[PDB]
Design an enzyme around this catalytic site. Structure first.
Site, PDB file in Angstrom:
ATOM      1  N   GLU A  35       0.823  -1.212   0.000  1.00  0.00           N
ATOM      2  CA  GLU A  35       0.000   0.000   0.000  1.00  0.00           C
ATOM      3  C   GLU A  35       0.868   1.279   0.000  1.00  0.00           C
ATOM      4  OE1 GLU A  35      -2.905   0.567  -0.814  1.00  0.00           O
ATOM      5  OE2 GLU A  35      -4.368  -0.638   0.196  1.00  0.00           O
ATOM      6  N   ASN A  46      -7.459   9.117  -5.941  1.00  0.00           N
ATOM      7  CA  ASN A  46      -8.204   8.181  -6.763  1.00  0.00           C
ATOM      8  C   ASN A  46      -9.096   8.937  -7.728  1.00  0.00           C
ATOM      9  OD1 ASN A  46      -7.399   5.705  -5.213  1.00  0.00           O
ATOM     10  ND2 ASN A  46      -8.366   6.901  -3.592  1.00  0.00           N
ATOM     11  N   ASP A  48     -12.163   8.791  -8.224  1.00  0.00           N
ATOM     12  CA  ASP A  48     -13.454   9.240  -7.663  1.00  0.00           C
ATOM     13  C   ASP A  48     -13.346  10.525  -6.841  1.00  0.00           C
ATOM     14  OD1 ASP A  48     -12.448   8.351  -5.209  1.00  0.00           O
ATOM     15  OD2 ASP A  48     -14.061   6.982  -4.774  1.00  0.00           O
ATOM     16  N   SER A  50     -11.556  10.873  -3.981  1.00  0.00           N
ATOM     17  CA  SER A  50     -11.037  10.534  -2.660  1.00  0.00           C
ATOM     18  C   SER A  50      -9.510  10.385  -2.719  1.00  0.00           C
ATOM     19  CB  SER A  50     -11.633   9.229  -2.136  1.00  0.00           C
ATOM     20  OG  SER A  50     -11.226   8.113  -2.916  1.00  0.00           O
ATOM     21  N   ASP A  52      -6.215   8.314  -0.485  1.00  0.00           N
ATOM     22  CA  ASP A  52      -5.758   7.315   0.471  1.00  0.00           C
ATOM     23  C   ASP A  52      -4.553   7.877   1.255  1.00  0.00           C
ATOM     24  OD1 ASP A  52      -7.469   5.104  -0.465  1.00  0.00           O
ATOM     25  OD2 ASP A  52      -6.194   5.142  -2.233  1.00  0.00           O
ATOM     26  N   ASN A  59      -8.922   5.412   3.151  1.00  0.00           N
ATOM     27  CA  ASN A  59      -9.575   6.260   2.143  1.00  0.00           C
ATOM     28  C   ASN A  59     -10.573   7.258   2.763  1.00  0.00           C
ATOM     29  OD1 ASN A  59     -11.980   6.569  -0.036  1.00  0.00           O
ATOM     30  ND2 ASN A  59     -10.032   6.230  -1.118  1.00  0.00           N
TER      31      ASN A  59
HETATM   32 CL   LIG Z   1      -9.552   2.378   2.723  1.00  0.00          CL
HETATM   33 RU   LIG Z   2      -9.859   0.485   1.152  1.00  0.00          RU
END
Ligand SMILES: [Cl-]
Ligand SMILES: [Ru+3]
Ligand code: NA
Length: 129
Positions: A35, A46, A48, A50, A52, A59
């Site tokens: 990650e 991302n 969309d 959002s 992370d 998120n």
């Molecule tokens: Cl998440």
């Molecule tokens: Ru997730």
């Protein structure tokens, strides 16, 4: 802070992730590696809208507030910036909330694609704790 592999494993053990919801420590270390590359300061946008945040790339659509994710929630009741600290407490506590919801560790696409069905225990071998 960029954690060492064993350093993160020990910190994750200390803050309660080993065997959390039946997920042995190696799962969590593996997920963090793919990650964030063990980097507490990692962020990724991302499509969309959002973002992370942090060592487990939590998120903003659901889990934290960043003031720019429209229509989102803040289920861990934290600013997303709290997930970027060298102190991993907020990330750990929030991850515990996430993994309790049904899908388990599959919420981490990285875990499903890179860790699940592999020798996850390998990520903690050679470590003191
Ligand atoms: Cl998440
Ligand atoms: Ru997730
Ligand atoms: Na949010």
């Amino acid at each position: 802070k960029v954690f060492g592999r064993c350093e993160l494993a020990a910190a994750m053990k200390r803050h309660g992730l080993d065997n959390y919801r039946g997920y042995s420590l190696g799962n969590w270390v593996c997920a963090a590696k793919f990650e964030s590359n063990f980097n507490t300061q990692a962020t990724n946008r991302n499509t969309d809208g959002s973002t992370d945040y942090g060592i487990l790339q939590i998120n903003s659509r659901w889990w934290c507030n960043d003031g720019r994710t429209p229509g989102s929630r803040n289920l861990c009741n934290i600013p997303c910036s709290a997930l970027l600290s060298s102190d991993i407490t907020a990330s750990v506590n929030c991850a515990k909330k996430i993994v309790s919801d049904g899908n388990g560790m599959n919420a981490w696409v990285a875990w499903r694609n890179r860790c699940k069905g592999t020798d996850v225990q390998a990520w903690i071998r050679g470590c003191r704790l």
